[PDB]
Each structure stands twice: as C-alpha cells, then as structure tokens.
Symmetry: D2
Subunit: 362 residues, 4 copies
C-alpha cells in the first residue's frame, strides 16, 4: 500500500484539516489516480453541515482530475499515464444504467453518499468512496466506468469541475431540456451551474438568453458571457420582466437556487408549452408550490434533473472539444487556490466572489 495526504472533514461543520493516510492498490475494474487538482462545489459544503447524512469523519471532493498511476486487472479501456476526469458513481448493470440513464441508477444514493463500498469496506486507511472518488487528496481510487479519458492537449488542472457542476448545467440544456435554435431561455441563479447552462444555450442557438440573480457582480459576468438580458430579483419583479422580454413567457428554463418561492416564479414565467428543469435542492423534505390551472391551461412541463442527464463517458469529451474550439469558455468561472487554502475556498464561494474554486493538489 501507499501513504498520502488528504483533507478530512471531522464533524458536523468542522474545517478541512490535512492528515496522513494510506491507500491500497486497485482491484477488479478499479483505477488508481494521481490527483493534479479537484474542483469545489456547493454540495461538498452542504455535506459538512450535514443537510445530507454522509457519515463523518470522511474525505470529500468530487470534482477531481489527475493521471493514471495504476489500473486493475479487468480494466480494458484505460492505461497508466492517461489524463482523466472523475465523474459521479454508477453501477452500469441496472435498468437505468442499461438504457442510457446512469444519473438515475437505482444505486445512486449508495455509490456516492453512503460513505463506503458495496460491503462497508473503506479503501482509505474514516469514510471514503464519496461520489466514488473522495478526491480532496493526492491519490484517489475510482472505477473504470466513472473514469473519463481526456486529451493531453489541455492543462489537466482545469478539467475536474466537468465531472459535476459544468456537466450539470450544460447537460440540463443540451440533454434534458433540449433548447432549440431561435428560442428563449432563462437561468434562475447565476452561479457556476447557471452560467454553465447559459454558455450551453448559446451553443444550442437560443436567440434570447436571460440570467436572474441577487449578486450584481455575477450578473455582470453573465452579460459578458453573452446573456442578452440580465435581471436583479431583489429590485425588479422577475416574472413580469421575463414575460415582457419574451412576449408572453420563456420557452425553456433552469432552476438552480434550490429556493422554493423562486421555483414557483420560474413555473409562472414559462410561456405556452414551456419547460422548466429543476437542478437546485432545498433541505431534505422541503416542498414547493405551483398554480394548477396555469400549468394545465399552458401545457407546462416541470422536470427533475440529476447531473445534466447524459452519459458522462460521451458528454464530458464533447464539452472539452467545444471548449478547444472556442465555443464554451467555462475557464472564465475559475479561480485557483493552494491545498492549504481549502477552507478559504469554501468561504469565497459562499459569499459569491468565487464562482468555481479549484484546489491545486499536485
């Protein structure tokens, strides 16, 4: 086995602290990865604060990128030295995995959120296997189906975030909603998820692209990214503004705040036959409201989306190619921090000055 450094979250709300640990060699179709850098997402934070019961203590991080250092014996599609992006955790044998919907895997809450493996064994010597990677560390063990080979022609430290927040936002528009050329789209919330979606609606051809938030600097960045219209929902009624701008209501929408009352607003601002995709979440158990009659008479659709609905092994490489061509500049949401500044990376994202932090590890 091997010794490594990893950031541990010791208890409800505790700060990340660096600790010395050990990781074993890979078996079956497992992969041993040398981590270069790992993105930081809202979800790592909500788990520390236990608004989700991942058992503590544990090693979090779910947006890793690195270099393969060792493959197991049944590994056939990856070799030592490949550059990879580590995405969420799926079984690939159930009904949803066999029909091209891994995000809906009947083992989704157990492979990413349990805190362990299939038996209760941990691969780190302390709970691990978080989103099947536990990547706030120098070394990570993943599975072949969640390890995505990417090109060596792009700096590898910048691509971790594609395994979660960027695919989630871009995917909601491309795979789930399917925005069409010449249509109107709006993103509720202008964080890294929303702005990823805004960049993808640009790629789909939409003619009207709107962003709604409460922090002014996030609204200025949206506009610089190509939002045709920006709206401050603290100072303006957003429903009324969206309806006048789109002459009746928007064709496509994204809810990324997780706020219930903003979510009703989002269903109300849809036009006839409009669709709203739901990616943000409130506390376990919260409900939201919608006006019945307005949804039934408008023929409106309300739909739930996990990780953008695609197949990551297919979609992740498509986003890297769109970026190399100059059509999807997600590198503009990023700011790099040192490993010993990981607690400061959390703070900046919560106050809104940093859209997408990336913990440099190697």
């Amino acid at each position: 086995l091997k010794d490594i450094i990893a950031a541990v979250t010791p208890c409800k709300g505790a700060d990340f602290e660096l600790q010395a640990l050990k990781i074993r060699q890979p078996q079956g179709d497992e992969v041993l990865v040398k981590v270069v850098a790992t993105g930081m997402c809202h979800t790592d934070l909500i788990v520390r604060d236990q608004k989700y019961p991942v058992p503590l203590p544990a090693v979090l991080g779910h947006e890793g990128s690195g270099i393969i250092e060792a493959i197991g014996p049944n590994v056939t599609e990856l070799q030592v030295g490949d550059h990879v992006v580590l995405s969420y955790g799926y079984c690939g044998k159930c009904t949803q995995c066999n029909t091209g919907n891994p995000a809906y895997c009947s083992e989704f809450f157990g492979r990413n959120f349990s805190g362990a493996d299939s038996e209760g064994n941990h691969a780190l010597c302390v709970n691990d296997h978080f989103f099947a990677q536990s990547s706030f560390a120098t070394y990570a063990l993943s599975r072949e189906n969640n390890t995505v080979k990417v090109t060596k022609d792009v700096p590898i430290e910048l691509l971790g975030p594609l395994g979660c927040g960027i695919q989630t936002g871009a995917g909601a528009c491309i795979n789930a909603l399917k925005v069409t050329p010449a249509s109107s789209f709006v993103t509720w919330g202008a964080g890294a998820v929303g702005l990823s979606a805004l960049l993808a609606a640009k790629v789909c051809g939409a003619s009207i692209i709107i962003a709604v938030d409460i922090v002014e600097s996030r609204l200025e960045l949206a506009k610089q990214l190509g939002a045709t219209h920006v709206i401050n929902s603290k100072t303006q009624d957003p429903v009324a503004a969206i309806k006048e701008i789109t002459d009746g209501g928007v064709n496509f929408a994204l809810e990324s705040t997780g706020s219930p009352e903003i979510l009703k607003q989002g269903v109300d601002a849809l036009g006839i036959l409009g669709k709203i995709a739901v990616v943000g979440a409130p506390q376990l158990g919260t409900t939201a409201q919608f006006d019945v009659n307005d949804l039934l008479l408008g023929g409106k659709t309300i739909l739930g989306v996990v990780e953008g609905s695609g197949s990551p092994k297919k979609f992740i490489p498509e986003l890297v190619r769109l970026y190399q061509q100059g059509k999807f500049p997600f590198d503009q949401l990023v700011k790099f921090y040192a490993f010993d500044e990981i607690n400061q990376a959390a703070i900046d994202s919560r106050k809104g000055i940093t859209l997408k932090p990336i913990i440099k590890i190697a």
Copy 2:
C-alpha cells in the same frame, strides 16, 4: 332565420329551463347542425356555479352530436347530411394551431369561454358560442374546424362525449403521456375521464392498470373494465399500496380529481423516471405542493394537459374505429335522460351514480 328550443342557465347556480329562441343561417366556414344528443360534463356544472366567469345568461352543453342541415359557402370538407361530433374551439392560424397543438391555441379562453364571437355578436337570439357550439339545443352553429365527420354505422346519439371527456382521458394516455407496452399506469379518480384513460392504457399494452377513488361502485366498474388493481383512498394509504404493487412506484399517471393533496400523492407514487399528467382542476388560483428532492433525484416529470393533447379531426375517428372493433367500450360509462330531465342529469353525476349522462334532444 329559424326558431328553436334550448336550455338556458339564467344566473349563478340557477337550474336549466327550456326557452324558445332563434338561430341564424351559417356564414363563411360555419356549420348549421341538427342536434341528436349532447353529453354532460363536470365543466358545464362548474360554469353555472361560476367557478369560471362565463357570462350569464347563456346556453351551455359542449358535448354535441347531430346531422348537418346547412354549410356556409367556404365549407369544403363537410356536406348536408353528414353525421358529426362537435369538439372544442380553436383558431387554426396561430403558432400552436399550425404546429399540431390546437388544444394550446393562443385563443383557447376566448373561443370557448368568452360567451360570444370574435366581435361580441351572438348567433343565438343571451350569451352563446360556448366551447364554440352551445349544444344544449335542437340546433347548433359550429365552425368547420371543430366539426368532425363520423361514420353513419354507429348510432349518432352515443358519440357527443367524444368531443370532450372521452378524448381527454384517452388522449392523456395515448398522445400526452404515451404509455408503453408492459408498463404500469394508475388513474387517480374513477369518473368518466379516468375510466376513459384506463380503457386507453389497456389499448397501449400496459401490464399493470390501477384505479384509485372514494366511491365503491366506481371502483367495481373499473375492475369490470379491466383494472388489474383497485384501491379505496379513504380506507387505505394509496401511495404505499401503489409502491408495493409496482415494486417501487408507477411508470405513468393521471390526476383527474382536481384535488391538490391527491396531486402531491400522485407525484410521490411515481417510480424512477415516472410521469404524471394533470387534467383535473381546482378553483382559479389554487396551488399544489410537491417534494423537491424526491422529484429531482427520481428524474420525475409533472405535466399539464388540455383535452388530451391531440388533433381531434384525427383522434376522434381513431377512437370510433377502436370502439367498432371491440377494443374501447366507452359505451359502458353512459346513461340516457330526456331533455326535460336535464337538471336530474346534473344531480346524478355529482352523487356518482352516473358516470356520463347524455341528454337526448331530437
């Protein structure tokens, strides 16, 4: 012009009373119909009680069938003597009508619910043009696009209800949801709309077909129509029953009670990637709730449906053909009343002994 007898609804909640009135000859693409019989629907009742502002006084009825007596000059697809079913009111020139979605016509609330025509002119000499027919009368004026030619080989008095409640229920399953072979389906509410949907899921191939209600005799009829499972939601927790029966949650569902708290139940009982279509309505302005997280993690879809989403000129004849073949026995929901018993037809549907009344007029 011509003299006729029609049932008038004089004020909030008043009883239908027979009155002598006059109807003019048809113009442009209008059609003059001799009514044989007209179905009765919940919606005629909710308009009398003004939970919807159709201006009173007026002639209601929106499920008519009859014989063409006179066509206007630009009428090209119908001739004197054809047997017809009079469906809802659409413009056929807007964006939704031109793309095959007439139920979503941008003039839907004005052609059926205004109480008049495009200018304010009434064709009956008193508000008319209700669902573009006003068919509780011996004579009705409709438009060519809402007048559907059907075969003379089936008694014409039995087909009126296809212009609304039967198409609504059958259409939600066939056109909107699209139930697939070997799947699980549930109808919340076992009235004429629900039982029409249940009969259509049988046609689509579903292997598990469930019906939930509170009146026992409606649950016995469902089962005799081929429900694999029936559930009384006064005596049993319906969510728990649906989840155990379908091993995790139903693939497809229909909400036809209009009750908000039953509607949350319906979203909760869906399985992974399930879909629930909404056709029943509460009072103008009411909202309903759903659990966020459960909808987002299950990839659930919630969708609004008006009149089954098809094109009636295409779908209505398809239902008559399925019926003649013996595959869609909607005649089992019907009971005939005389024109002078129209007030009693309302009472029986509200207490649940009569599923679908048909006022015989000729």
Copy 3:
C-alpha cells in the same frame, strides 16, 4: 380588375417573355400582393424543361416577397401594407396539415403543381397558381395560410428566397434531422440549398461541418461561410475522406444533388446510427441503391424531406430573426438582376456562378 406585367413560359423549354395580363380582386381568405422581388430556384427551370408536367403556358416564380395591397373578407391575420414572404401551397384542413406537417399535405401536388385552382379557374387573365403564387409578376394572389408577415426593418427584396430554397436547407437540419451540439454534419452539393443547411448546422452547434461539390468556387465560399472541411468529389474519394475526418463516418447528412450514385455514397459515409436527409430529386421515376447489410448493421436511417419539414408561419420568422442577430448570413448567396434579365438569371445558376438569383420587379 387590374392590369399587370408577368413573365410567361410559353412551351417546353421556351425563354421567359414579358406579357401584359390581368388579375382579379381577392375573395374569401385570398391576398393581393404587390411584388418587390422574387427569388429564382432550380425547380422553376426543371418545370420549363418539363421534367415535371405543369401545363404550359404559365407564369412561374415561387420565391416572392412584396407588400399587401388588398385582403379578402375572411382574412383576419394580415392587413394592407404588411410586408410578406409567399411560401408553398397547403390546404390546412387535412390530416397532415392538422398535425403540424403542411409540407406533407395530401393536396401537395395539386396546390403547387396543377396549374390552376380547386375548380380549374385561373386568377390570371394561361395557367397560374404555381406554388400558390405564380410570382414572376408585378402582382400576385396568394392564400392567407401561405402569406407570411415579416418585419419592415429588413429590406423586403432580399427575403423571397426564404419561402423555398433557404427554408428547405436550413429546415432539413433544424426540423428534420435535428443536428445536435458537438456532432459531425456533411452537405452533399454546395448550391444555395446546401449552403443554407451548412449555415444552420453552424447554428445547431455541430463541431465538424463538411461540404462536398464539383465546382471549386462554391467550395471556396463554403469554407468562407465556416465549413471546417471542404472536398472536391471529382479529384478525391469523398467517402474515404469523410470517414477519416470523422473517425468512422458522419452523424448527420444532406443529399442535395439529386444524383443517385452520389446518394449511395452519402449512405455509405454515415457512421453508426447516422442519418441522411434526401432533398434533391432526379427525373420522375428514377431509383437509387444502398448496401443492405451496411445499413442494417450500422442502424442507419434514410429519410425523405419536403421544404425542410417545418411550419413556415413559425420557421420563416425564426430565420429572419437569426439573420438580424448576425447568426445566419444567407444574404451572402445572393445576386440581383433586372426583370428584363430573367433569362440570364437562369443561365448563371445553371453554370454555378450565381448561387441564388433575385429578380427585382418593383
């Protein structure tokens, strides 16, 4: 009635000649248009040469734009003075028109190709009603459903071609094929139809955009319009080139030459699960070949497309909006000629120096 000048095609292969004729006022839902300019298409030429039996003599032209001068009495969506684009001819009452497929109207060969109206009456005083417009004239009579209102903010002489060749090419990609973001597309033939499709695949997000032709200047223009790759099929094996460029075969394709042997090439160059749309036509009765096994084992799709499959009343305005935004520069295929140079406009398109001619009439 009114006197006008129109170009007549007197016999198999005869030259257009200007003649003095008369046009009547509009009835029912008919529209009287003052023509500003009319595009020229390959199809006008093939009808003169009678590879299609439109009865001669007659007034052709099927890509008109103008100003409304008079509306009939049942016209409700257009007024005197609107600027319009005159598209093909559809009934709007049959099964295909009622489901959002007017291009497939069961009266398609009779409304555009018969040479007359529903009865045999001609509106021009000599066969007319060609594509329901006969627009190589100072005045044209159309129907409300084929007359598309557009903005007064764009010169009206440039938009006629949107009623046929530009919608055909752009529509095959947007409505029929549905090209997806990051995919590979190829257009066989780089004339106005192909290059319209190439511009639309740019709008849909495709990462690889290929054009194949035999005239070098058309290949240079494609590349300047944003083709990633161009291929001369006289000098290079195009199948082999397309397969190496897309690492196995293209995802989406368009056949616009009408040449059978090029069409087999097009099915062979598709990759697994690829799709090829057919818009070009050979002589009535010609067949084409495909390799069976390759289509069955690759899961390939071969599909027929008329006028881009959309709804023109919806799609035409979407293209004008994409153009105003700077995302669909179809004005680069155009060259203007005087009315008395109409015979020279035919010659230039047949030799390939002119992509899309526009006969200026007003």
Copy 4:
C-alpha cells in the same frame, strides 16, 4: 475443467455431428450455464454455408436457456441456480453501450462473429464464443451482461428463442418503429421473426395488421394469430392490395425476407410519412433500390434494425411477462426436436413447416 457433448460444424456446409469436448471454469464476470434447450435460427444456417465468415470448425447455437452452475468472482447480479436466457454479445463500455444501444456496440462483429475471445483464446477445448455463448451444448460460458435472469414459473426450455428471433421481431415494432394505437402495420415474410412482430403490433394497439408471404400454411397461422388481412405475393400484387386495404399505404412496416426486390415493394407500399424497418439480410455486399421522388415527396423513412434495438436485460423480462398474462403467445411458433435430430431441425425450417425449432439438450 469439465467434459461435455457439443454439436460441431466442421466445414463449409457440413452437418452438425456430436463430439466430446471440455469447458473451463468461469473468470471475472463470466458465467457457467447448464443448458436445458437452445433455439435454432436462420443465422446458424447461413454461417455453416459461410455466407458470413465465422471460422470453421466451431460450435454454433445462439438461442440458449439453462441454469446457472457457476458464477465468476466479479459477478454480482446473478447466483447459482438462477434460470437464464443467453442473448447476443456486447461490450457495455463503448459509446453505443453507454447510451442504451447495445445492439449497435462498436464491437458487435467481434463478440459474436469472430470465433473467439478478446485475445484469440477459446473457452472450449475449435472456434467458440459464437454470439458469446456457442449454445448447441450441454454447457455454455457466457458474460454477466448477456445472461438474463428469468422467472422459475415458466418451463425454461421454451425461452431460449427470446435471446434472438422473438426479441428481434417484437422489438422492431415496440422499440424501433414504435407502432401506435389505431394504426396500420404490415410484416413482409411470415416466419418466426415476422410473426413475433405481428404479435407485438397486436400489443401496441394497431387496428390493421397484415402479413405477406409465399407459403400458404404460414399465412394461415398468421391469421389464426390475429392478422386482420393476409396476402400471397406469388398470386397477388401485394403493393396494390396493401394500398387499397389501408386507403393509401401502410403507416408502419417490417422487411424480414432479406430479398431486395421485396424490399423496394415495401418502401412503395408505405403511405404518407410511413416507416419501414429492415431486419432481413441478403449476401454480404448486396444492394436494394428505392424510387427517389416517391420517398422524398411522401416523407418516407427507411431504417436499419439489429436485434430489435432494445436493451435485452430490460426487454426480455417484459416479453416473458406479456406472455404470462396471455397477451403474447409466441409458444405457438415452436416445435421441439431431440439433440440427435438437430440436422432435421435445419431441414424443416428451410422448407417452412417449422417456424421455430428448439433443440432439447438436458
């Protein structure tokens, strides 16, 4: 290792002969199956006659059913004693396998047709691994992803054929074409594949169900299975008959003869917007013809289909459930033979008296 009996095909066209061989224990995610019975398909025959280059000598059979006798160590979804159906061979890691299209796996010709494994190793001690099973033997080795658990409540000897011919025919209608309620369908060729499709169109709700063949007894069985119309294409022009019966052309079709000239007939008999799925194959390299203009003006679709396009792990159990309910009586195509009568089973299928043979082995 273990000793067994298996039928070997020694050379171009040789007869099956029983031989004594040996099979090894399973590794990784491999499965050791005790075979009860194996269906016989046209494809076993075409490989013996080498119209496809599977290297001889080898053990064929590709429609097996049996009992699990041993699982490898990474096997998680199957246990010793389960009853299974062995379907075709897929990788489950490529782009097509990850998006829910295993039939289109980029390793399809190598996993079923190579004659060996990934390296050239054979598991039988002589070429094996045929359709990843080689099931004309008492023991078979398969992979976990091609081994489908089914219920112990149905005799296991009857279900092998579901791993190929029955799924192919039923799947073309349910997954690939998607026949809709009240539509018209036709199957060209009334063998086990066609009649499986005919039984599935019954399940999808079609109102008109046609079967075309040249052997009279196969046409009598179709009709007894519920074909509304039967046609002998030796004695009647089938195009003309199909067009008059469906008033213009059929909505959906299946080509299962592999005959090119019958395949053009099939595209000609489609009605506006019709679709024809291609499952039968001619010799490697053969082409077929279609009329261009008729396909382009009708908006017709021609599509290639392998093994019914579904996901077998999902679809196979759906067919067994439809059968138990009494809605898909595929047991009527079957006749059982002894293992030592396997050469006679080939003869009877080629002369058409036996629709689907099943070699009883245990």
